[PDB]
Design a binder for these strands. Structure first.
Ligand SMILES: O=c1ccn([C@@H]2O[C@H](COP(=O)(O)OP(=O)(O)OP(=O)(O)O)[C@@H](O)[C@H]2O)c(=O)[nH]1
Ligand SMILES: [Mg+2]
Ligand SMILES: [Mg+2]
Ligand SMILES: [Zn+2]
Lengths: 83, 104, 8, 85, 53, 158, 263, 1111, 94
RNA sequence: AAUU
DNA sequence: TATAATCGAGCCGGGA
DNA sequence: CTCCCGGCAAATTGT
């Protein structure tokens, strides 16, 4: 199926995305009937909630990366093998 | 807990009533002389919460030692005035009315 | 289509 | 008829005050003063009371009233929130 | 922009829309920035086609 | 580097190319009044003649600069890419060329003057049509582009 | 329903839409208790539907409800949510922000690519909370409350506070934005250089990505607050670290105009 | 100094009175100075005759009069009053039954008066009514886009004075009429007019296939009455077709000269197109009990003949300036008067029913409130009533001559395409092709041409000279566009010997189309080149050399020039700069011949021939709408003999009677170390030293003290907790003293307000209690100086309640106004421009020693980058500099008219004479050619600039004739390696000044519903970080920066409070919370009966209201 | 340009992971009063005051310099989150 | 309505 | 609280 | 086909 950007944009699974685009009443009435759940996959959804977007420093790929200095690494390493 | 999802669904009259803190019985807004809100009108403190933080309408309970008390004289809860942004009222229709989105 | 006209 | 509801008798007084001023303006060829209306209203009325009555008769204005230029700005947008710290 | 493999997490869709959109608009306020002399082919015969596609 | 009025150098070739273009134009009117070419055919031939004379005069401007004035400010700004392009320089030192009516159809009559020589009120007025259409184009188009961009962001944002 | 400055009242259109509803509902209740004929009860019921209709989406069906003696449709719940002026595209996908400012931009040839000229008076406001803490560490003010009072009157500002501000902004970056923000380089990060004067100084090489000239263009300034935001600005958003177009891959920060001319 | 004027064109007529489009229109509408029996039926007069008589008792109109103004002009502005006259009307009430006649003169309210210069004062502020272009009423025929060989006839009346009619010939062959979106066969209407097939068959039969589409048998079977009832049922479904009801509806639509008004211009266009005569402004009549046709048959006849290709029938060009007309101030205002009049008539009939049906006069019957409101509505809230642009005198002159296609009765901005914005050929000589706004309004708002005038019908006419035979007469004919298309019009520069055309071939126009023609074919000739362009465009010398897109900017920017204390006229003028000042009315002139009795800063007293001693007070440092200082200065001395029309005082931005929008500075064109980059400008500190580009600006501050339910606000010197340092400059009453210097934070007017009920917090009670200063009843609300403002206090106005002559709005005890002035020296970030569209912001101010300088030590003023010229193609600025160089040394100024100007040879001659002064002085003083002048000459001859083998003096002169000089860098002393263009240029300081635009905010006011920062500098607003800005942060992947924008720096209340607290404590800012505007979104969706639930990963609800919203 | 910015992009698989490491590290330094730094007294970033050279107050600068030394270890699932926080508060209190 |  | 009054007055694309 | 509803660049200022 080939649809233009507007229709494609309006057809996305995320109803917070679609309702903020255009056709807000239509988007919202069909969403409300279906009992739709927005999973907050994309950016617009997260911007609307004031969340940390899933891109850049917000990607799950880099988000949880830890930093520690060699002293603190060893400080913890002996204590955690110890007991 | 952390917000991972947003659901949107139709609201039953039961649920609309489960939200509501009171029925708005009067078209009144605020009193023309005192400028205080009119009882049972669109701004009533007995429904939507106190205008001033931790202070009831008539001022029997004026500070946070009472939080959760509902003043017997004036009927207003002692809490944050911020709730006037949150607590919903409701109107009980004599005849059901259709929601225009689901019609038009 | 006109509520007044209808009532009349 | 009023967003801020007014007692029927008070509404009666206001309309009377209106009618009177309209008379005063038709004979004086210009807007009457508060004092001129208070005389025209008879006993009990001074200019201060004429003014207070008009203050009471002021209807609120819409927060959505558009400001000049393009329709790209509403009046409520220029009002600070004096309540929240 | 870095002449090197893209980093995981880069918001590529937004960058694609800005990359396509930016000359659209840009070159539609530069036809003034031109002369007034006629030498056909302008972003305003092209852009309708782009929108058509 | 500066710009004075003598820095816009009218090539000697201009007067020749214009006189040449006028004798050419007379043959096309004669081929009209004798009914050899239509009004359609005649107008098309006029535009082509003037397009080619314009190109010629541009090349003359740039050859004269390169050979006889390679450090001329206009030439230097245009060649280095600091400012200016051939078509703009042609309008300073050359002829302005053909201008178009509001409908988009081009005038048969060109603007023979250059900004150094100065235009004629009628030439100036003929030019306003194109300026205005360009100005309206820019204003009504940025919205179409702007709208386009928002669609692309909305469809690709995830 | 708020009292504006002059003691006058300003109120939202929704209050009038609710009032129509409440009036019509109450009248309907009364007509029922009084046993009105069906013609009368029917008229009330259809008027009640219209009142609900204007409340939820005014203008959607039938003539739009207006305040008396105005042609302006009252603004209903649907109108509030949707459109350019709607809740989503106005207060949700974009907002007005704190720690921001604007001024006229001016060229600053002497700047390094990672720098901008930032007016001292602007920086004092944009960094004001940071400045208060520093004014306490240096004995310049007894505490934070006193320091703010000193900045309020312009004749009360002494010269040691300017050195304090220099210490505050050290190594930090600010964001410059020039509208329209057509691509991501409409915003770039610069380390600010405090300047006398009221103009922001922009580096020549970034004028192309911003499409900035000096015919009177203005730019907006923003202060990233957290360690995370500041890290993001200096690494990802710093002008010197974005030299190539994300679109074509060609150099974006490159010689132009006078620079080309001289070389 | 000498003034040398160029040009060979002798202009037979002067420019018309420039504000006549305003002045004459309103005078014509009011006719106040005409005695009532002699008033013509137009304007106010015509409005009265239309509304009356009011039937139902019959109330009839006798005459009106306008009183004198209650307050003079200066007074209205002071007190926030409208400048207006009392309107009265003599009305006679008649009881048609009794015969009774009671007559009284009733007061209808006030009407606003136009000042001498053509503006209005509405509530204290000066306003302009912009003329409106629109489609002229008449009958038009346009081609049908769907079916190529067919056409549509449109009968169009004046706006809101009737419906549009369309006569289409449908593919089925019948002629259809379209009214109020409903269509029917036109035949039905023909029968109602009393036409019978005999008349119609014989009349239009000549057109073979067309007359049969009109023939419908069933319609002829019914008499005009059955046809009238039949039509009414078609147009108004559900309304019972009562015989009196149908006449009433249809009459009101067609024959009522009250509900349907074609123009007077409409009548002429109709009479002229169809070759008929209209008895009135209606399409038909009600005469002798039936309807009698006027328009319809002639319009139907023309339509059939055109479709058939009958000779003499044309389509109408709807953008032709013969079919587009101007609605001037008078006409626009009169329309609102007519509406207000009709509402009052509704009021009359309702009062002729209620109360005593017997005991009524005209005074009890008339309520003027509907009339006062209609006029007050037009002047206050109309889209054509605009705040006057009075930045400089030219600002206002241009505003009054602007033409708008927008407003009530014209396009919308989203509703106008290319055709209207285009420059039509008929704009020649009528509407300026250059001066229009850049941006969304381009082509909708335009400006009247200099020699154009609007006639009584509303069509723009432009003057042309008669040419009979080969002789050019001096008789000028103002022509409409329609009439102009008839003749062959020669160009104004066509060579002349005497009154005879001296060229064998002339350049002329036929229908705007350029054509070459013999002197025998010349019917008329342009009066002047000035007639094609607006006044602003006409102030640009060498306009013939500037690309239009830049000349546009040149025009518009003169509007924004700020009046300078040292303001000067340009050294190269066009010759219009005297007339603009005179018509503007800023300058003061002598009435008759006379002698100057007294000369003061405040006044000039003149002794005339009459013997009478006339005193002219001068406006000194008055604050205009835009805060530029309008101030008049005396130009004559005691005892000076003055003639009629001699200059007395200079207005703002005028020098000895010539328009002074800027200064003449010595400019060098050359890059300078990148301070010149991309249009930035470098200036010498010498400009500030001698106070060039310094302008006075006044800002107005206002404060009210009002009655409250908590008690009175008081304006007082007593302000809680304030030092004597803070109150020092306040007088006894709490008002800042005249002359004090006020800076941001300083108190302007002291004021106290009673503390609200939730009075001092118990925390505040105890704190004050500790210090033994018991808590005060009132709080400090004083008016203070905003950030970035301040100056010297030049005025205070105080208005209380209970003082003679003043009454404020209800509740307001007193109003205080403080006027603060500032002398603004030019600074970095201020914007400069010349008349050719070169504009830039000042990026660097060099000390005089860094400025490039001439060998003789004279430093230049401004350095403009040459990179701005070639792409812009505005070369007039270059020629301006060369002639400006000549003038610098010769000590002279020039008048070079547009398109008939100084040419190169003439500029070269002047330049040679200058070189003699620039050089010969040196050679006689005992100085020879410089070593460095030789080095540059070497390089210049490599450039082909100088001829090799001539003496240095000869070569320097060769360069000087090219407008180039040797220039020494003040830093090095070394020459610039090439000769540089130097000369005098006219440059203006525009109204865009950094001082006004610089803004910054840490935290400040927030909005009520959204809790996001307010907008704009005046509210201490935050910047909008909008959708596209968010995209930028997204594309950078800056997630934490973006989240800050969405929460802590905006509507996250908990977050922003915590973030601020952390910064003042030295901690890092905390992780954000929920944006309040999302909570607003959630509740707004609940109000729509939609349940929005934030859920966790387990699909359990998450409460983002933290228990506050659940019972 | 930030000093050694190219080398820093060398150390990571994704530029955004550098920003995360830098940002988190700068927070550790601020929270513990810099006394957990891996830098040596002559490597400390310096700031020129009116008095003279003082410690660079900017924690993001510190972290980038520290990172370049090589003395910092970054990655995922190196250690329980709570355990790290407590071990650092033990070595360098607040 | 302006500014870019 | 009582004469009698009785029916109003901008162009464009896309989807049912 | 016809009609009916949804769209139609950004930031800023000014009365
Ligand atoms: O409506 C507008 C108007 C103007 N602008 C912005 O201002 C600029 C118009 O101003 P310019 O005419 O100078 O365009 P330009 O700078 O590209 O021309 P040159 O230097 O090449 O001679 C535009 O390029 C645009 O970014 C807008 O964004 N929107
Ligand atoms: Mg530019
Ligand atoms: Mg610009
Ligand atoms: Zn109570």
């Amino acid at each position: 199926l080939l649809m233009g950007v507007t229709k494609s944009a309006l057809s996305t699974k995320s109803w917070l995305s679609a309702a903020s685009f255009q056709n807000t009443t239509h988007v919202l009435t069909e969403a409300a009937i279906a009992g739709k759940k927005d999973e907050l996959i994309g950016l617009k959804e997260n911007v609307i909630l004031g969340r940390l977007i899933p891109a850049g420093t917000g990607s799950d790929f880099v988000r949880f990366t830890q930093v520690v200095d060699q002293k603190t690494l060893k400080a913890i390493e002996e204590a955690r093998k110890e007991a | 807990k952390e917000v991972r999802k947003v659901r949107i669904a139709l609201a039953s009259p039961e649920k609309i009533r489960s939200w509501s803190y009171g029925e708005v019985e009067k078209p009144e807004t605020i009193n023309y002389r005192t400028l205080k809100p009119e009882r049972d009108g669109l701004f009533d403190e007995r429904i939507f919460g106190p205008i001033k933080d931790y202070e009831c309408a008539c001022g029997k309970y004026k500070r946070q030692r009472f939080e959760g008390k509902v003043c017997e004289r004036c009927g207003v809860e002692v809490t944050k005035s911020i709730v006037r942004r949150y607590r919903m009222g409701h109107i009980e229709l004599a005849t059901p009315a259709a929601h225009i989105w689901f019609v038009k | 289509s006109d509520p007044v006209r209808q009532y009349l | 008829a009023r967003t801020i509801r007014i007692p029927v008798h008070m509404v009666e007084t206001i309309n009377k005050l209106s009618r009177t001023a309209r008379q005063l303006q038709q004979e004086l060829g210009r807007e009457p003063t508060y004092e001129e209306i208070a005389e025209a209203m008879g006993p009990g009325w001074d200019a201060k009371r004429v003014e207070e009555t008009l203050k009471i008769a002021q209807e609120p204005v819409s927060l959505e009233t558009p400001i000049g230029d393009e329709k790209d700005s509403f009046y409520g947008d220029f009002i600070p929130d004096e309540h929240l710290p | 922009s870095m002449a090197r493999p893209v980093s995981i997490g880069e918001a590529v869709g937004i960058v694609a829309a800005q990359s396509i959109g930016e000359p659209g608009t840009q070159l539609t306020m530069r036809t003034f920035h031109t002369g007034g002399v006629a030498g056909a082919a302008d972003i305003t015969q092209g852009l309708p086609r782009v929108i058509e596609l | 580097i500066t710009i004075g009025i003598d820095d816009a150098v009218i090539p000697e070739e201009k007067k020749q190319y214009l006189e040449e273009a006028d004798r050419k134009l007379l043959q096309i009117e004669q081929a009209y009044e004798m009914g050899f070419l239509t009004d359609r055919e005649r107008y098309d031939q006029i535009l082509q003649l003037w397009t080619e004379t314009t190109e010629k005069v541009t090349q003359a401007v740039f050859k004269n600069f390169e050979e006889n004035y390679p450090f001329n400010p206009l030439y230097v700004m245009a060649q280095s890419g600091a400012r200016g392009n051939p078509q703009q320089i042609r309008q300073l030192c050359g002829l302005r060329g053909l201008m178009q009516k509001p409908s988009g159809e081009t005038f048969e009559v060109p603007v023979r003057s250059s900004f150094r020589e100065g235009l004629t009120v009628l030439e100036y007025f003929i030019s306003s049509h194109g300026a205005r259409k360009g100005g309206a184009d820019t204003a009504l188009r940025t919205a179409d582009s702007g709208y386009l961009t928002r669609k692309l962001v909305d469809v690709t944002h995830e | 329903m708020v009292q504006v400055d002059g003691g006058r009242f300003a109120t939202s259109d929704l209050n009038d839409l609710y009032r129509r509803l409440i009036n019509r509902n109450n009248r309907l209740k009364k007509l029922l208790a009084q046993g009105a004929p069906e013609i009368i009860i029917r008229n009330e019921k259809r008027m009640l539907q219209e009142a609900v209709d204007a409340l939820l989406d005014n203008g959607r069906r039938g003539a739009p409800v207006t305040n008396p003696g105005s042609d302006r449709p009252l603004r209903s719940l649907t109108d509030i949510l949707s459109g350019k002026q709607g809740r989503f595209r106005q207060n949700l996908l974009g907002k007005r922000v704190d720690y921001s400012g604007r001024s006229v931009i001016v060229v600053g040839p002497q700047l390094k690519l990672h720098q901008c000229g930032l007016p001292k008076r602007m920086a004092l406001e944009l960094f004001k909370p940071f400045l208060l803490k520093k004014m306490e560490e240096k004995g310049i003010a007894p505490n934070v409350k006193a320091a703010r009072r000193m900045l309020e009157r312009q004749r009360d500002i002494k010269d040691e506070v300017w050195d304090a501000l220099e210490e505050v902004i050290h190594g930090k970056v600010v964001l410059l934005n020039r509208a329209p923000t057509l691509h991501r380089l409409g915003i770039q990060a610069f380390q600010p250089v405090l300047v006398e004067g009221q103009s922001i100084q922009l580096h020549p090489l970034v004028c192309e990505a911003f499409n900035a000239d000096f015919d009177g263009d203005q730019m907006a300034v923003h202060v990233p607050l957290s360690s995370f935001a500041q890290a993001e600005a200096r690494i990802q958003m710093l002008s010197a670290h974005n030299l190539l177009s994300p679109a074509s891959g060609e150099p974006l920060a490159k010689p132009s105009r006078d620079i080309i001319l001289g070389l | 100094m000498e003034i040398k004027r160029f040009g060979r064109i002798r202009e037979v007529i002067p420019l018309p009175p420039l504000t006549e489009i305003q002045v004459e229109s309103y005078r014509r509408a009011l006719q106040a100075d005409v005695p009532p029996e002699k008033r013509e039926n137009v304007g106010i007069q015509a409005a009265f005759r239309e509304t009356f008589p009011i039937e139902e008792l019959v109330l009839d109109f006798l005459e009106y009069r306008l009183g004198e103004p209650p307050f003079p002009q200066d007074e209205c502005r002071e007190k926030d009053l409208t400048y207006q006259a009392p309107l009265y009307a003599r009305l006679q009430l008649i009881h048609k039954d009794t015969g009774l006649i009671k007559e009284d003169e009733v007061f209808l309210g006030h009407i606003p008066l136009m000042t001498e210069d053509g503006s209005f004062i509405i509530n204290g502020a000066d306003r302009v009514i912009v003329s409106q272009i629109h489609r002229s009423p008449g009958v038009y025929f346009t081609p049908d886009p769907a079916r190529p060989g067919r056409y549509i006839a449109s009968i169009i009346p004046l706006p809101k004075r009737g419906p549009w009619i369309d006569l289409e010939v449908e593919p089925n062959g019948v002629v259809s009429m379209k009214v109020n979106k409903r269509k029917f066969p036109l035949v039905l209407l023909l029968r109602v007019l009393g036409y019978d097939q005999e008349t119609l068959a014989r009349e239009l039969g000549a057109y073979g296939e067309l007359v049969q589409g009109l023939m419908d048998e069933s319609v002829f079977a019914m008499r005009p009455e059955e046809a009238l009832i039949r039509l009414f049922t078609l147009l108004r479904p559900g309304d019972p077709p009562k015989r009196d009801k149908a006449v009433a509806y249809v009459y009101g639509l067609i024959a009522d000269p009250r509900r349907y008004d074609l123009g007077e211009a409409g009548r002429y266009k109709a009479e002229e197109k169809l070759g008929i005569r209209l008895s009135g402004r209606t399409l038909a009549r009600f005469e002798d009990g039936e309807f009698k046709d006027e328009v319809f048959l002639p319009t139907l006849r023309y339509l059939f003949a055109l479709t058939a290709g009958v000779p003499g029938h044309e389509v109408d060009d709807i953008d032709h300036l013969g079919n587009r007309r101007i609605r001037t101030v008078g006409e626009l205002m009169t329309d609102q008067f007519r509406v207000g009049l009709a509402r009052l008539a509704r009021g009359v009939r309702e009062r002729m029913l209620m109360g005593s049906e017997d005991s009524l006069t005209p005074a009890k019957l008339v309520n003027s409130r509907p009339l006062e409101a209609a006029i007050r509505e037009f002047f206050s809230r109309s889209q054509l009533s605009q705040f006057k642009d009075e930045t400089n005198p030219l600002s206002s002159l241009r505003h009054k001559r602007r033409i708008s296609a927008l407003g009530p009765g014209g396009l919308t901005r989203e509703r106008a395409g290319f055709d209207v914005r285009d420059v039509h050929r008929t704009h020649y000589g009528r509407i300026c092709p250059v001066e229009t706004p850049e941006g969304a309004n381009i082509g909708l708002i335009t400006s009247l041409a200099a020699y154009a005038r609007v006639d009584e019908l509303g069509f723009i006419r432009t003057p042309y000279r008669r040419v009979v035979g080969g002789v050019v007469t001096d008789e000028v004919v103002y022509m409409t566009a329609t009439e102009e298309d008839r003749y062959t019009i020669a160009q104004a520069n066509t060579p002349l010997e005497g009154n005879r055309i001296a060229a064998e071939r002339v350049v002329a126009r036929r229908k705007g189309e350029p054509v070459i023609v013999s002197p025998e074919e010349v019917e008329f000739m342009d009066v002047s080149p000035k007639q094609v362009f607006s006044v602003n465009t006409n102030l640009i010398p060498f306009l013939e050399h500037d690309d239009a897109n830049r000349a546009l900017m040149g025009s518009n920017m003169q509007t924004q020039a700020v009046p300078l204390i040292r303001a000067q006229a340009p050294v190269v003028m066009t010759g219009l700069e005297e007339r603009v000042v005179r018509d503007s009315l800023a300058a003061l002139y002598a009435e008759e011949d006379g002698e100057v009795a007294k000369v003061d800063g405040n006044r000039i007293v003149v002794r005339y021939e009459d013997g009478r001693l006339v005193e002219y007070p001068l406006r000194r440092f008055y604050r205009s709408n835009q805060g530029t200082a309008l101030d008049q200065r005396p130009r004559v001395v005691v005892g000076q003999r003055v003639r009629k029309g001699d200059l007395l005082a200079d207005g703002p931005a005028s020098e000895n009677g010539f328009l002074a929008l800027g200064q003449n500075v010595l400019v060098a064109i050359m890059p300078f170390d990148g301070y010149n980059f991309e249009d930035a400008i470098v200036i010498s500190e010498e400009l500030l030293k001698r106070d060039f580009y310094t302008s006075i600006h006044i800002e107005r501050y206002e404060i009210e003290a009002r009655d409250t339910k908590l008690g009175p606000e008081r304006i007082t010197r007593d302000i809680p907790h304030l030092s004597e340092a803070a109150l020092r400059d306040l007088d006894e009453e709490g008002v800042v003293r005249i002359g004090a210097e006020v800076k941001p934070g300083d108190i302007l007017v002291g004021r106290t307000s009673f503390k609200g009920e939730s009075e001092p917090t118990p925390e505040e009670r105890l704190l004050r209690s500790i210090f033994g200063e018991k808590a005060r009843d009132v709080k400090d609300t004083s008016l203070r100086v905003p950030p970035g403002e301040g100056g010297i206090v030049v005025r205070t106005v105080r208005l209380r309640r209970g003082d003679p002559g003043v009454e404020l709005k209800p509740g307001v005890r007193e109003v205080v106004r403080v006027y603060v002035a500032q002398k603004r020296k030019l600074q970095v970030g201020d914007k400069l421009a010349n008349r050719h569209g070169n504009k830039g912001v000042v990026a660097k101010i060099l000390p005089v020693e860094d400025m490039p300088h001439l060998p003789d030590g004279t430093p230049v003023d401004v350095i403009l980058n040459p990179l701005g010229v070639p792409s812009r193609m505005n070369l007039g600025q270059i020629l301006e500099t060369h002639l400006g160089l000549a003038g610098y040394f010769l000590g002279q100024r020039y008048i070079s008219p547009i398109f008939d100007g100084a040419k190169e040879p003439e500029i070269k001659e002047l330049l040679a004479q200058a070189f003699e002064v620039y050089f010969g002085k040196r050679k006689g003083e005992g100085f020879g050619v410089d070593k460095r002048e030789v080095e540059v000459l070497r390089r210049a001859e490599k450039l082909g600039l100088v001829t090799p083998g001539k003496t240095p003096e000869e070569q320097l002169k060769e360069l000087f004739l090219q407008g180039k000089v040797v220039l020494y860098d003040g830093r090095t002393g070394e020459p610039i390696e090439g000769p540089i263009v130097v000369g005098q240029m006219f440059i203006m300081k525009l109204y865009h000044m950094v001082e006004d635009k610089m803004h910054a905010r840490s935290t400040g006011p927030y909005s009520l519903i959204t809790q996001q920062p307010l907008g704009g500098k005046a509210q201490f607003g935050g910047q909008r970080f909008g959708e596209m800005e968010v995209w930028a942060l997204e594309a950078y992947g800056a997630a934490h920066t973006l989240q800050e924008m969405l929460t802590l720096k905006s509507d996250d209340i908990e977050g922003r409070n915590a973030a601020y607290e952390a910064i003042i404590k030295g901690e890092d800012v905390p992780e954000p919370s929920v944006p309040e505007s999302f909570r607003v979104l959630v509740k707004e969706l609940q109000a729509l009966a939609l349940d929005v639930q934030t859920l966790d990963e387990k699909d359990n609800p998450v409460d983002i209201f933290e228990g506050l919203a659940s019972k | 340009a930030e000093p050694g910015i190219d080398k820093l992009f060398g150390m990571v698989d994704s530029k955004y992971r550098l920003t995360v490491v830098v940002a988190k590290r700068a927070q550790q330094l601020l929270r513990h009063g810099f006394k957990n730094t891996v830098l040596e007294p002559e490597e400390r970033p310096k700031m020129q005051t009116l008095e003279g050279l003082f410690d660079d107050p900017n924690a993001v600068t510190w972290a980038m310099k520290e990172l370049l030394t090589g003395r910092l270890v970054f990655g995922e699932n190196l250690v329980p989150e709570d355990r790290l926080q407590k071990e650092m508060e033990r070595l360098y209190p607040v």
